[model samples]
Target chain A: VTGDTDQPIHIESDQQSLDMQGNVVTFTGNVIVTQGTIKINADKVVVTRPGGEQGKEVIDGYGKPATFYQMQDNGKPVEGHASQMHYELAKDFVVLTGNAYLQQVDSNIKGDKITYLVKEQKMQAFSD
Target chain B: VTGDTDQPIHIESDQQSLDMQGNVVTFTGNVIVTQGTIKINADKVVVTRPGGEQGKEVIDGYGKPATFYQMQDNGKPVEGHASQMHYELAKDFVVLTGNAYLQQVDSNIKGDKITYLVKEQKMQAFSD
Candidate 1:
């Protein structure tokens, strides 16, 4: 149902703010996140989750263009770029908006909207 | 012409070694690389370019699986995953091997090998 969902998540940035009451964590100024081979970078990153679902993590990244990268179980590389990125761990999917683009070795895809499936290793670029 | 090819590629990891004489840089241990909208993640990354082509850049990333992501000129997002990834600036291409995968907006693709064409918004996934 999920992909690489069990990896430990680590984060780095110049500053961070954790709102315990809201169950939100935010990082700013060159934010970098790593969980196993998965990595995300942006000017700012925010994470949120419901208390009842400890394993469910939702990530939002913003920047001139936020970026996400990861290695697949098959040992291939995955890459994504967008102005705003939304990741849903339980769904094993990522959505890119605001001039989203994705690259996979000698191939490139662009669209007004894009979504990626981690477990299925699939992607969709759409317009209109 | 290349896009964001000279944005001062920055990398971070647990260990790094540079062979200036050979004009090569290697990074290992939770590696992360950022250049404009482009981001790469892997256990190790190697970069090289012909001395004559200072502006030209070639990136090779390796790991249990390597990952890549970038933003398009239009602000769309792009994503890729593989065991090994190779990027060339002059040709604006990315190549993924060892269970390569690429994703863009609600769609995903996987193969033994994949190639991505930057600037062209095109991709190919295949296996023999």
Candidate 2:
């Protein structure tokens, strides 16, 4: 799970499995992950190896949930939705637990458990 | 779009257009909307529809980039964000456009244009 650090954010899917401890890398099936620009689709994803397992790591987005696409340019794909979500990789920690909500167009930000922080791009939320 | 602000969150999709002047009702096109449990997807959804076409209707979440979901406990579906968003659906006006963002569970709220509201149940955001 250490293809070097800080420069890792390109993940694809079909199958992936990991279990790193020195830097923390926990991943499960159907997990698509990415870094740098950030892209993720998950069943389970835990990557806490930026510089000594930098804290956040634990993403479990079930089924139709678990998505994080931020590529930009042609645009319209700055997303992080949930049908069952939970992200905390690096920072701007997220957690949209089941039926949770946070849309991009025409606005929406619901809750059951929504917490956030995206720093430079801006996205802040906290729910119950 | 006028049935008292707080009690106008029940919109159904297919097609809904409005332009009232007293209790806000500024809904526009291919807009499938709902309030109370919240729901929306737009090409043009300006729902100031709840008090004189309120000042929060100018939802142009454009095309496939307009969606707001919130009907909790169904266990997933909490959102807010955009590809092209602008929602002023009453007091909790929303807006998501051209790659805006927000999500639940693992959390997110990317922005290009995002604004939000939903007082009692909780959901609030703002960005330019």
Candidate 3:
């Protein structure tokens, strides 16, 4: 949750490509990202740093259904899945599209598009 | 957003009652709660501290349609409304019931019940 943003971000994949000049990195085939209590599993992921290290980091994930999870301050976990996911590190938000579903504890929500504001801890979902 | 939890909580109402022995406080008639970027407006609110000063805080809000709002890290705002609202401070969660509607940016969701995990940035809504 809160502290997870301060943790180091780690990524693993079967293949990786770094375009230093473009400030973009691509990961393909079973890409997994871990940062503190947060985890993301996807078929492919693209990372872009608009203004280099000083700027913001944008992550794009694609899969049959990319899945995400993070532990809350209370120790409970929140989970979600979608065909595509876009995360803005500096903005502390994520957008999920195409058959999106999010769950916290026993309750769950489903929609065609879902946007989660990580730092604000707010979510918006839309159907069709 | 993330920092809002650390901010001090303030409440205003037409009438208030404090039950020190029970560690419970009640507010009635146009109760409003403000904590950093978070705001809640309701007809009445009941606050309970199960463990006194060092323990968790639980807040229950009732209204014809209780409304809530909080600013995200990106400076955007999330808004919601429901007939009844239950909030757990230490747990970092909120439960909305009875014609619940939540919105962030241009997207929105509606259901009979909605549970939002504040720390984890996850939301679950149910139709029935």
- Which residue pairs overlap in candidate 3's backbone? none
lDDT of each: 0.68, 0.48, 0.74
Query: What TM-score against the true fold does each predicted structure earn?
Result: 0.42, 0.25, 0.42
Tens digit per residue, CA lDDT, model 1, B1-128: 12455566788899988785777878889999887677889999888866846767688889777887776644445666778877766554567777676654333443322222211113445696
Q: Please estimate how well model 3 matches the true structure, expressed as its whole-model Cα lDDT.
A: 0.74
Q: What is the interface RMSD of each candidate, in Å?
A: 18.1, 18.3, 17.0
DockQ of each: 0.03, 0.05, 0.04
Poorest lDDT segment (10 consecutive residues) of candidate 1 chain B: B112-121
> Candidate 1 docking category?
incorrect
* Candidate 3 local lDDT, A1-128, one digit each (tens): 77787788899999999885978999999999988887889999999998688548888889988877776775445667788777778766567777776655422332332222323445555798
Error of 3 at A83 (Å): 44
